[PDB]
Design a protein around this ligand. Structure first.
Ligand SMILES: *[C@@H]1O[C@H](CO[C@@H]2O[C@@H](C)[C@@H](O)[C@@H](O)[C@@H]2O)[C@@H](O[C@@H]2O[C@H](CO)[C@@H](O)[C@H](O)[C@H]2NC(C)=O)[C@H](O)[C@H]1NC(C)=O
Lengths: 48, 49
């Protein structure tokens, strides 16, 4: 919900004593996907 | 008198950005939280010292 709720949830307590508490590390997530394959048009001769 | 304070994200070390590995690591229970509780206790003590 908010950073205090994440401390209550990490301490496993509905009350939090005075302090500084470490919590889930933040991390920026993907904006989009990329694929980069060598440009090849001809199919492989599996029939042969 | 003291040593380097460290913190180690048990998820990013074990599973770095994989979700499949996170859902498997959850089957061990509290071991990641216990490791961070240990390294935080060492780190707070470097300032006490
Ligand atoms: C191997 O051959 C089968 C079918 O045999 C040939 O089918 C015709 C295309 C013609 O060449 C006949 O003289 C041969 O008997 C191929 O199977 C087909 O595969 C495509 C997809 O690639 C599918 O749309 C068709 O419905 C399939 N038809 C049949 C009958 O199987 C198969 O692709 C061939 N394998 C390779 C590696 O070329």
């Amino acid at each position: 919900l908010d950073p205090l709720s994440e401390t209550k949830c990490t301490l496993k307590s509905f009350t939090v004593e005075k302090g500084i508490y470490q919590t889930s590390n933040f991390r920026v997530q993907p904006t989009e996907s990329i694929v980069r394959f060598p440009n090849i048009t001809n199919l492989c001769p599996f029939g042969e | 008198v003291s040593m380097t304070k460290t913190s180690v994200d048990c998820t990013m070390y074990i599973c770095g950005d994989s979700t499949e590995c996170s859902n498997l690591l959850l089957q061990y229970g509290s071991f990641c939280t216990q490791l961070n509780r240990a390294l935080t206790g060492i780190a707070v003590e470097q300032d006490k010292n």
